[PDB]
Amino acid sequence: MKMKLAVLPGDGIGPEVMDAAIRVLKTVLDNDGHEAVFENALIGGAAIDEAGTPLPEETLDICRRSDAILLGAVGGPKWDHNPASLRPEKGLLGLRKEMGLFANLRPVKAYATLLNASPLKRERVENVDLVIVRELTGGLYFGRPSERRGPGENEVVDTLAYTREEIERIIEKAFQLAQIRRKKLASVDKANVLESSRMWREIAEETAKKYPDVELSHMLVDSTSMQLIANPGQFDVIVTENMFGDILSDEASVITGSLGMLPSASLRSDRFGMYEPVHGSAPDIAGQGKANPLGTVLSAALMLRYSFGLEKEAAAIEKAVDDVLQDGYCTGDLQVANGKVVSTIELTDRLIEKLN
């Protein structure tokens, strides 16, 4: 299997962490009979510098011929002022659209040595292993109209907009995800109030028919909001609209005390996707050795799982992450049990070390 990967590390610690992922990937694969070709491309401030554009035309080409995209992060002070038209961030938004990625997977699982750091009591969070799927293309964030309205513009409106295709494909993906996980999907909406939620539930219920083994259930966003605190262990896969996914993923991002090493996947219908850590570029700590490579490494694992169906490998990588953490190593950000602070590379070496 000749895997074609597009490496787009980006700004700040972007390239630092990316290096971990690439090292770990080469290891995991190259030892069985799995080719993997990397091709670097600029994006964000790095591309602004070498091509006056957050998203270089050549980058899209690089990506369009690759089986998946490995991305770090973008943004930096060096560009925090030029026209918002040509800011690092825009190049990323464009890449998402240009690739037609509509789903955002934000898995959240507990790690024994990170429990003390969790804001929740040990008992509440110790078995968390969920994934929140967020719709990216529709919702209030894209809905038009959206403006003030006379007289004197003392009226305002934002529009929650969705198409049957958008809602269908996202849900369809959530079922596929749940199928290969614990066959359990909670569809989250506000169906007793919003017509888009009403339609959403119907489509969820429709799709459930094509996925018999998956245990579908519905839960309102306001309830899911407290369930993620009171009994987050109950979830396997959660799927929801754009703004609900936005708020819920942020809430969930702190329950296991692993915020800072959370992985992220952006998918569409085919097996093509864009993997990246949830954290930003942390420009000011670049080159200092303090960047945490875990998030990005866990991304590469998701990549192997979602884009190539290589669950064996993807799983190996994840155990390594658990084990290194099990020994108590972090780079200063995570508050691990019996913590020993090492550098981004030291931590990577310990990782690849565990991988055999």
Among 196, 258, 299, 307, binds a copy of itself (CB under 8 A): 196
Rounded distance, CA 220 to CA 240, Å?
A: 10
The DSSP code sequence of 240-291 is E-HHHHHHHHHHHTTTTS-TTS-EEEEE-SSS-EEEEESS---GGGTTSS--
190 is catalytic: yes
Beta strand 273-277 pairing with 146-149: unpaired
**Residues annotated in a binding site for Mg(2+):** 222, 246, 250
For residue 148, state whether it binds a copy of itself (rule: CB under 8 A). Answer: yes
Listed ranges 40-48, 153-161, 178-186, 337-345: which one lies at the site for a copy of itself (CB under 8 A):
153-161
Among 1, 32, 100, 159, binds a copy of itself (CB under 8 A): 159
Of the pair 169, 354, the CB lying nearest a copy of itself is at 169
Of residues 4, 109, 129, 141, which has the active-site annotation? 141
For residue 31, state whether it binds a copy of itself (rule: CB under 8 A). Answer: no
Of residues 67, 189, 246, 329, which has the active-site annotation? 246
Answer yes or no: are the C-beta atoms of 299 and 21 closer than 8 Å.
yes
Measure the CA angle with vertex 269, ends 268 and 271; round to 5°. Answer: 85
2 is catalytic: no
Listed ranges 43-51, 80-88, 248-256, 260-268: which one lies at the site for a copy of itself (CB under 8 A):
248-256
211 is catalytic: no
Beta strand 263-267 pairing with 273-277: antiparallel
**Min. distance of Cβ 285 from a copy of itself in angstroms?**
21
One-letter amino acid for residue 109 of the chain = K
**Min. distance of Cβ 289 from a copy of itself in angstroms?**
26
The count of chain residues that interact with a copy of itself, using the rule CB under 8 A, is: 49
275 is catalytic: no
Among 30, 32, 50, 165, binds a copy of itself (CB under 8 A): 165
Kindly list the distances between the CA atom of residue 153 and the CA atoms of 142, 143, 144, 156, in Å, as whole numbers in the listed order: 21, 19, 17, 7
For residue 80, state whether it binds a copy of itself (rule: CB under 8 A). Answer: no
For residue 337, state whether it binds a copy of itself (rule: CB under 8 A). Answer: no
Q: Is residue 109 classed as helix, strand or coil in its secondary structure?
A: strand
Kindly list the distances between the CA atom of residue 234 and the CA atoms of 66, 213, 228, in Å, as whole numbers in the listed order: 37, 18, 9
Rounded distance, CA 119 to CA 326, Å?
A: 19
- 72, containing H or E segment: strand 68-73
For residue 154, state whether it binds a copy of itself (rule: CB under 8 A). Answer: yes
- Give the residue numbers annotated as catalytic, written as ranges: 141, 190, 222, 246, 250
| Contacting positions for a copy of itself (CB under 8 A) | 118-121, 124, 140-141, 143, 146-148, 152, 154-165, 190, 193-199, 221-223, 225-226, 229-230, 243, 246-251, 253-255
